[PDB]
Curated annotation (Swiss-Prot):
Homodimer. The cytoplasmic dynein 1 complex consists of two catalytic heavy chains (HCs) and a number of non-catalytic subunits presented by intermediate chains (ICs), light intermediate chains (LICs) and light chains (LCs); the composition seems to vary in respect to the IC, LIC and LC composition. The heavy chain homodimer serves as a scaffold for the probable homodimeric assembly of the respective non-catalytic subunits. The ICs and LICs bind directly to the HC dimer and dynein LCs assemble on the IC dimer. Interacts with DYNC1LI1; DYNC1LI1 and DYNC1LI2 bind mutually exclusive to DYNC1H1. The gene is DYNC1H1. It is linked to Charcot-Marie-Tooth disease, axonal, type 2O: An axonal form of Charcot-Marie-Tooth disease, a disorder of the peripheral nervous system, characterized by progressive weakness and atrophy, initially of the peroneal muscles and later of the distal muscles of the arms. Charcot-Marie-Tooth disease is classified in two main groups on the basis of electrophysiologic properties and histopathology: primary peripheral demyelinating neuropathies (designated CMT1 when they are dominantly inherited) and primary peripheral axonal neuropathies (CMT2). Cortical dysplasia, complex, with other brain malformations 13: An autosomal dominant disorder characterized by global developmental delay with impaired intellectual development. Some patients show signs of peripheral neuropathy, such as abnormal gait and hyporeflexia. CDCBM13 is associated with variable neuronal migration defects resulting in cortical malformations. It comes from the Eukaryota. It is found in: Cytoplasm, Cytoskeleton. It comes from Homo sapiens (Human). Belongs to the dynein heavy chain family. Cytoplasmic dynein 1 acts as a motor for the intracellular retrograde motility of vesicles and organelles along microtubules. Dynein has ATPase activity; the force-producing power stroke is thought to occur on release of ADP. Plays a role in mitotic spindle assembly and metaphase plate congression. This is Cytoplasmic dynein 1 heavy chain 1.
Length: 65
């Protein structure tokens, strides 16, 4: 489910260029977003239960993106 949501966000982000010419986003930028959510996450620190970590990861992905 997280991977599906991640793909949806990136493609929505890519198609966002239609409403304004300025919004030109590359794949590397979205990869940086996803890796920041994945690696450098304050909320993930101190949590070992995987379900809670995935909930934190998806919420933080939405917010950080």
């Amino acid at each position: 489910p997280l991977s599906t949501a991640c793909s949806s966000i990136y493609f929505t982000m890519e198609s966002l260029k239609q409403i304004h010419f300025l919004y030109q986003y590359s794949l590397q930028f979205f990869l940086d977003i996803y890796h920041n959510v994945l690696y450098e996450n304050p909320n993930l620190k101190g949590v070992t239960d995987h379900t809670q970590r995935l909930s934190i990861i998806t919420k933080d992905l939405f917010q950080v993106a």
